[PDB]
């Protein structure tokens, strides 16, 4: 009777994070959902969320459905699976867990079907999503097959910019791209001690262009590095647009739009 929705809506976004396509919500936010066996089966679980949701008690297993042939249709029925489903909820009925995480455990054993006993996730990605020291980078964008990306960093006098950019350019992870371009700029807020130098390592046409680019963009005292990578066809629909919004915040934040 306090933040029951927040935790509820959070488990939704959490199960989403773990398994998107696998879960299907009948209702907009929580209330009623249909999850399908994590093995990507065909037996879908119809579950509702009563006024006494996880916090109060637990969700409500309303029904189960399954796409089956005449091979194992005699072994289990929908109402039958519903019975064991319920006895499993009994587990996720008095735990600090909401349901989804703990109940899959029992289902994992009772439903059987065990392929292997190991885990292999996907952690291979060129596109940077992790933070950097001194550096604030978060703008990877997508193009046909290619990937675009930029790293911004607020800086002080020339030593700072020189070192952090030196290092970054000679860094083997940034070294992995097709062509990288960089631009640094230092302008005294209200003084004359300014240090500026050009670049052209990757593509030379981008060197002076990027320089005047940061000039016309109304921005100083901050550095930016752009890199081009090759990936899949479009890498992912959620890659460019969604990160664009996030990236937009970073670039602006690091002092690109003050």
Helix content: 25-40%
Beta-strand content: 15-25%
* Beta strands, count: 8
Q: Rg to the nearest angstrom?
A: 26 Å
CATH class of the domain at 136-254: Alpha Beta
SSE class: alpha+beta
Summarize the biggest pleated sheet.
Answer: 4 strands, antiparallel
CATH structural fold name of the domain at 136-254: Ribosomal Protein S5, domain 2
**Helical segment count:** 6
**Overall outline:** elongated
Order of helices and strands: HEEEEHHEEHEHEH
The spatial strand order of the largest sheet comes to 1-2-3-4
CATH architecture of the domain at 136-254: 2-Layer Sandwich
Looking at CATH, the homologous superfamily of the domain at 136-254 is Impact, N-terminal domain
| Span of the ends, CA to CA | 43 Å
């Amino acid at each position: 009777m306090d933040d029951d929705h927040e935790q509820l809506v959070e488990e939704l976004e959490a199960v989403e994070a773990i398994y998107p396509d696998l879960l299907s919500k009948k209702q907009e936010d929580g209330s009623i959902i249909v999850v399908k066996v994590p093995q990507h089966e065909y037996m879908t679980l119809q579950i509702s969320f009563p006024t006494h949701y996880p916090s109060e008690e637990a969700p409500n297993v309303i029904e189960v459905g399954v796409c089956t042939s005449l091979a194992k249709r005699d072994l289990y029925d929908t109402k039958y699976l519903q019975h064991l489903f319920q006895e499993v909820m009994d587990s996720v009925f008095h735990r600090g867990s909401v349901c989804l995480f703990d109940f899959l455990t029992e289902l994992d054993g009772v439903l059987y079907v065990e392929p292997e006993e190991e885990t292999e996730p996907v952690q291979q990605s060129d596109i940077p999503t992790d933070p950097f020291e001194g550096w604030t980078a978060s703008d990877p964008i997508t193009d046909r097959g290619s990937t675009f990306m930029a790293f911004a960093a607020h800086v002080t006098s020339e030593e700072q910019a020189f070192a952090m950019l030196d290092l970054l350019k000679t860094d083997s992870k940034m070294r992995k791209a097709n062509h990288v371009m960089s631009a640094w700029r230092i302008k005294q807020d209200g003084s004359a001690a300014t240090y500026q130098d050009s670049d052209d390592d990757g593509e030379t046409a981008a060197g002076s262009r990027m320089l005047h680019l940061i000039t016309i963009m109304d921005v100083w005292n901050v550095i930016v590095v752009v890199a081009r990578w090759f990936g899949g066809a479009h890498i992912g629909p959620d890659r460019f647009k969604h990160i664009n919004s996030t990236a937009r915040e970073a670039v602006v934040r690091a002092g690109f739009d003050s």
